[PDB]
Paper text:
The best characterized and most clinically important efflux system in N. gonorrhoeae is the MtrCDE tripartite multidrug efflux system, which belongs to the hydrophobic and amphiphilic efflux resistance-nodulation-cell division (HAE-RND) family. The membrane fusion protein MtrC, containing 412 amino acids, bridges MtrD and MtrE to form the tripartite efflux complex MtrCDE. This powerful efflux complex spans the entire cell envelope of N. gonorrhoeae and mediates the export of hydrophobic antimicrobial agents, such as antibiotics, nonionic detergents, antibacterial peptides, bile salts and gonadal steroidal hormones.
MtrE is a 447 amino acid protein that forms an outer membrane channel. Here we present the crystal structure of the outer membrane MtrE channel, which represents an open conformational state of this multidrug efflux protein. The crystal structure of the full-length MtrE outer membrane channel protein was then determined to a resolution of 3.29 Å. Like TolC and OprM, MtrE exists as a homotrimer that forms a ∼130 Å long α/β barrel. Each subunit of MtrE contains four β-strands (contributing to the 12-stranded outer membrane β-barrel) and eight α-helices (forming the elongated periplasmic α-barrel). In view of the crystal structure of MtrE, it is found that the internal surface of the protein forms a continuous channel. This channel is completely open and fully accessible through both the periplasmic end and outer membrane surface, suggesting that the MtrE channel is at its open conformational state. Each protomer of MtrE contributes D402 and D405 to form two concentric circles of negative charges in the inner cavity of the trimeric MtrE channel. The internal diameter of the MtrE aspartate ring is ∼12 Å, which creates the narrowest region of the tunnel. Additionally, the distance between the Cα atoms of these aspartates is 16.0 Å. It is suspected that the open conformational state of MtrE reflects the low-pH form of this channel, as we crystallized this channel at low pH which would neutralize the aspartate ring.
Author numbering:
A (entry chain A), B (entry chain A), C (entry chain A): 21 to 465
Write the structure that this text describes.
């Protein structure tokens, strides 16, 4: 009989629903394939190779394999190991008298512990739950990869557009600063013209560099995640506003969304493992029995080996039970119980963190949308203001400074739009990941 | 006799005083209870539940309990373990001749190592200092919790006021943008009015969102630290300028402030542990002695068991001393000495980091006060400028742009005041924590 | 014979060259001594003491020493351990009959495992490669120190100049705000003068504090890295533009630059270690042989000990071979192979990260130079604009606001130049470090 306590799931005090659920889509995030979630064909292609070559995933998938093997050897302790032990012995007197030789060549199993009280059985169950938890950690490593490779690609495309944004503002100032010298001469506060002229163009250059630099940092971080230098045959990609298929993931009930999270099911298996370790410590109060056996030829001389009459066998069953261990037996159980008491608060820590991981992602997608829409219409307005003054200068103006200031306000309000355009895209990848999504590639029946 | 070297505290080269001590209060930070340090009744309430339910603290307090148990079992190696070992044996010839059976059912202790040279004693001392250090780490986990839950609450209240700040600037622009159209018609650089009009209102909306989003992130991080969704029956709280009772903590002498730090006393116990491991390795040059004993009934047949005459006893004291170990004995000691040589530089690393942890907190509270006072009077000035122009527009003005620009300068200079109002509050919680404060709830006799 | 597989270096798919190599210098970064790389005599002095006293380096250099010792004891398993075991035994009847005593005092080696199949040899090789890898990690800890202490010093000097920058802008506003009241009375939009007047001076004060605070944080972090409070006898140092000797490091071929990196050679030794662990598991299919021997005096009474005729000796060679282990033998090898399969993907992860570590440092030094040059000429232009208006106000002006606005634009454009002046300097220290540089102090023959 085994002595492992029944598994009762811990009561994590947490809200039953999220105060930010607005979606109605049937398709769950976990159910949704990432290939049907991420839009950019370039990004879709990148994941397929990274999912095949990523070191962290390769490592995480190997560790789960050795935990399977470590389990398979622990289950083998329930079976007798057969060994062919051939040994010899020899005594003799120092003074120069007599000697004695005994040669035993035989086969036999040494101390098979008959697990009557599920001590080896429970300790083998720990190896299984240890493996089961590692598999879930392998899944968590799978989801963390797709989220990371996506957010690192969004940082690239942002910088791509950040360069081009500062590229054409260097081109639109190019046609104006030469025009500000061929234009009809203005006032003497024209001195307030080359200073912002320089201020616009030389900030635009500093921006292009920062963009071009962060572009490479995203480019290089991508080559690491795919274990390969970036290939050539790739579609030019889509802008940040076209990085996701039109869909917002639902997160129904908190109990529902907990089941999909790998890091959560990894916490219950690591707990079930600690339960098994109790069944091993609780069986220590019980007697342990061990069986020794052997066959073969016993002899005094090598010549007599394997000759008729020398055949012997053995059977030595030895059992034992501790009567007073000075509380050590009680103590080792207490440890096994505390080791398990820590796995329920680790399970609680896992849930409370997992809930927060989602509630933030929901609050972000809501507010990174409202904040983005504001910064976008601001860009449109500042762009419109630029065009109006763009005609004023074309006709009769008292200052290119007006037009020039309008260029910078339109440039700054547009760069601030790209900033929120990325932050919204990044969180979208986190929302998918933290919702358990990214498991399968394609959504199917 | 034991062979553990006497504990001499390492000489950490560090300044004796801090160049930022300005306080004169008798009440030490460590002596000061956090309930008498933190002002907000809402925050005071939050800590009491988090201190009872936090996972990280629950884990840290469990680990110190298993280190007590792991110690209790190591002290038990100084006592003989009694076991009732009943065993049987049986030999026999293969050809079909004779057999032999010997059944021994008895009681006895197996190999009690009489620790004459404090080898088990020292190795048991390591288990104690290991436990003593874990207790100090449990205290460091206690202090880190209060500091974290406080700084996470300040981030909430900041966002609460950040929303309301942008809320009324949306309300004050509301009454002006409708008024800027019903006002008497202005010039043609009125075109320089709706652009900043849009720029003010649409930045205020982007601010409210960022504030409302970071509000939830602080709200969610709070629900994690308390292992519970946030309750309802709570006082509305106090503003950031009312988060601390009027008091600045003193940090007298560097030697003085080192003693209160848990992470420091944890470094000396982890060192004392390494000292104990030397007393075990240094006793390896000495002979180890072991005692075997047993009583019970020896027999050839089960029937004879527990029948008169079968009573036997045993006493096998076996001692041994290594003569030449090929330097392995010297090597294992060298390791034990190096393992201890690393605990003094870990102690040094602990102190040099602990000193920096305080010196920064002192330099910050000084400069986050001077920088805050400047940003605050700037807000007052910009607010005053707004009111003056607020009357100009009310009478005879040539531009709502003046008034409108004054709104944004007053809004920006006020939001920059809240930013420094939080950073000053956060560091205040760190100063208390890094000074050893936060141990007891209430300051007492 | 040993059974450790030959070492074949993994094929890391990575670009052969960097798309940012522009230097032509023969002197490699690794070949270049840091004393000939870092310019500031104050910084050069600081490293020499930190390299002697840093805790993290002291720890890293100790761990490599214990790995040498742990190896030396594993090599000793190939040699017999001699022990002088003197033991006694005693049986007796409970009823009150007969007793029996046997006293054996002798010398002998217990179970020397004759390693015929390189099982101990291979397991000892793992201890060597484990040590070899720790040495490389000790080098990586050496390089990480110089990089860290340099970047922490640049942050200090930045703040030093940041304070002085805001110090003289408080001095130049000092002579103007008293002059703005003694100047001839201006218009009624003079109201648009004290608001930016306050805005300039009160931002300059907030800047000085932030600078003075971050100055101490860099000052304190420096005292930690050198395990000592900062001394006095030190040259005042050089500005950020004078922190490096005029030289840009070359990074020829990717294969070339991989060899200098300590973290890379640490990954191959940790791999070679896993190779050795296979030679131990692959030898488990083979029989293990063990030799027991002893000499000394056997007796029934203590008096007979060491008296003629009692001299006995022993020689018990015992060998054994597992026939069926239920796949456990195959499993333990599979683990040893998977443990090694993980060290090649850890080697791949090491390389892909090491390449990125350099490619970013190259792209940064290129773009942090172009972005810096732009922000610098912007400062010159804004400074020039200030002087021109500085003469306008000196003669006939309609607003100190013009001059006052010119002060802030010149102040802000100069502080933004120092910001890029530091970021460029920091990356320069990382480029040197990530290129394997910082090993030797002085570049030599």
């Amino acid at each position: 009989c085994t002595m492992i306590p029944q598994y009762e799931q811990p009561k994590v005090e947490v809200a039953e629903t999220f105060q930010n659920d607005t979606s109605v889509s049937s398709i769950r995030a976990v159910d949704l394939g990432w290939h049907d979630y991420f839009a950019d064909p370039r990004l879709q292609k990148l994941i397929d190779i990274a999912l095949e070559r990523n070191t962290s995933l390769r490592t995480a998938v190997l560790n789960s394999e050795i935990y399977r093997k470590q389990y398979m050897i622990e289950r083998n302790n329930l079976l007798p190991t057969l060994a062919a032990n051939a040994n010899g012995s020899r005594q003799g007197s120092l003074s120069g008298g007599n000697v004695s030789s005994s040669y035993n060549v035989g086969l036999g199993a040494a101390s098979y512990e008959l697990d009557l009280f599920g001590r080896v059985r429970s300790s083998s169950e720990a190896a299984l739950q240890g493996y089961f938890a590692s598999v879930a950690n392998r899944d968590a490593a799978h989801l963390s990869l797709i989220a990371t490779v996506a957010k690192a690609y969004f940082n690239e495309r942002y910088a791509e557009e950040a360069m081009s944004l500062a590229q054409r503002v260097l081109k639109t100032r190019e046609e104006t600063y030469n025009a500000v010298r061929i234009a009809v001469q203005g006032r003497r506060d024209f001195r307030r013209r080359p200073a912002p002229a320089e201020a616009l163009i030389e900030s635009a250059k500093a921006d292009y560099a920062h963009a071009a630099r962060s572009r490479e940092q995203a480019r290089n971080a991508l080559a690491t995640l795919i274990n390969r230098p970036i290939p050539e045959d790739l579609p030019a990609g889509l802008p940040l506003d076209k990085q996701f298929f039109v869909e917002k993931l639902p997160a129904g009930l908190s109990s529902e969304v907990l089941l999909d999270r790998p890091d959560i099911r990894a916490a219950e298996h690591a707990l079930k493992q600690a339960n098994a370790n109790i069944g091993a410590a609780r069986a220590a109060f019980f007697p342990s029995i061990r069986l020794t056996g052997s066959v073969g030829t016993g002899s005094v001389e090598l010549g007599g080996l394997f000759k008729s009459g020398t055949g012997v066998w053995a059977f030595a069953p030895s059992i034992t039970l501790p009567i007073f261990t000075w509380g050590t037996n009680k103590a080792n159980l207490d440890v096994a119980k505390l080791r398990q008491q820590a796995q329920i608060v680790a399970y609680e820590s896992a849930v409370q963190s997992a809930f927060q991981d989602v509630a933030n992602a929901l609050a972000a997608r809501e507010q990174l949308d409202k904040a983005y829409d504001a910064l976008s219409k601001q860009s449109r307005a500042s762009k419109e203001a630029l065009r109006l003054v763009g005609l004023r200068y074309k006709h009769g103006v008292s200052g290119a400074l007006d037009l020039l200031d309008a260029e910078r306000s339109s440039y700054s309000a547009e760069g601030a739009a790209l900033s929120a355009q990325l932050t919204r895209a990044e969180n979208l990848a986190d929302l998918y990941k933290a919702l358990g999504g990214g498991l399968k590639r394609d959504t199917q029946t």
